[model samples]
Target: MVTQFKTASEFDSAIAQDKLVVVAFYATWCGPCKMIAPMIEKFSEQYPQADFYKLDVDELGDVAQKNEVSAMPTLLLFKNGKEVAKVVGANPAAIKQAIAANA
Candidate 1:
């Protein structure tokens, strides 16, 4: 399962890593996000090397306001403890490509 974060600061510290940490920054009321989210989980299967998480925009502080999550299903990929790639829509190609290159 893609676990949701308890708060923003855990998000703040957890992301500070050398591994590829993937987070789904989405909203509670969502559509396309639901559609695209499964692949993130599947990506979790494909790459067990990465850490996968989900953060509702309702968390509203560390990641959201910092411009990490501007859209629902904002696929945020962290490497070196910061965003190295961001996918902003239900674009499978983008998600696949971004993670492929970065992973």
Candidate 2:
């Protein structure tokens, strides 16, 4: 299972890792977020070099604010602790493209 962030510390540490990381910043009220939840899991299985994580924007206000994720289902692709690409909304193709580009 993907690590669902419960604390800002954990989230910060994960983002700062050396490997590529894909973080799905989602909100409780986001419909697309729910739909892509399973897709994210599948991506985790497909991409071994990249780590997948789910973050509750509503719960982790600190992280949401820091990342400037104003929209739901905002997929941020990070490489070497830096943001390489951002896919705002539920675009699987774009997400995959971003990941592949980063990888």
Candidate 3:
């Protein structure tokens, strides 16, 4: 499933639980983010064992700021309550590699 997060608290809970979360910081209007939305959705299905969450940077502004997120489609990987990897663009291959390598 394409996990949709409405608030930082929701994501925080996942983090506290030590789940492996792949947070895609995105915006509705970002073209690249939109382009990979389907791929992300499919990836979720392909890897049901993983915790995937999409964070709307526009709505969850504070969370983005706290993470120092300056761009859209940034992939932040968290494993066992800590960030283990990061990818700053919508590069599908790179993101997938990071997930496979880190998660």
Candidate 4:
């Protein structure tokens, strides 16, 4: 399952690991965010080697700003607590490829 994070502390704890972590930064009112929800869920199942998470930009703007998220539905790929890749927009194929390439 794709875990939803409400705070930067939660995000910090979740990514503090020696593995791949995929954080999807989105907003409640973003159309593409809603559209890409199912695809992210599918990736959670398909790529068990990586951890999947979602951060609501509307609620956690500080975390979004900290991560330099200038776009909605930005997928940030972290490997062992470091950012390895980033995918903007709702492209599932690119997201999958990023996971494959980085994970």
Best-matching candidate per TM-score = 4
Comparing 1 and 3 on TM-score, the stronger one: 3
For all predictions, the C-alpha RMSD in Å is 2.0, 1.5, 1.7, 1.3
Better model by lDDT: candidate 3 vs candidate 4: 4
Q: Tens digits of per-residue lDDT for model 3 on 1-103?
A: 5688867777666665565677777777677887457666665566756677888787778888766676887777787667877767766666676666666
TM-score of 1: 0.82
- Which sections of candidate 4 miss by over 4 Å? none
Model 3 residue runs over 4 Å out of place are: none
Candidate 2 regions with alpha-carbon error over 4 angstroms: none
What is the lDDT of every predicted structure here? 0.72, 0.76, 0.71, 0.79
Which of candidates 1 and 4 reaches a greater lDDT?
Answer: 4
- Expressed as tens digits, the lDDT of each residue in 23-99 for candidate 2 is 88888887788855876666667776788888988788788877768888888777666787777766666666667
| Candidate 4 lDDT by residue in tens digits, 1-103 | 7888878877776667678788888888887888557777777678888888888898889999877787988888787567887777777777787777787
Clashing pairs in 2: none
The superposed Cα distance between candidate 1 and the true structure at residue 18, in angstroms, equals 0.8
Model 3, residue 87: C-alpha shift (Å): 1.2
RMSD of candidate 2 to true structure, Å: 1.5
Q: Comparing candidate 2 with candidate 3, which one achieves the higher TM-score?
A: 2
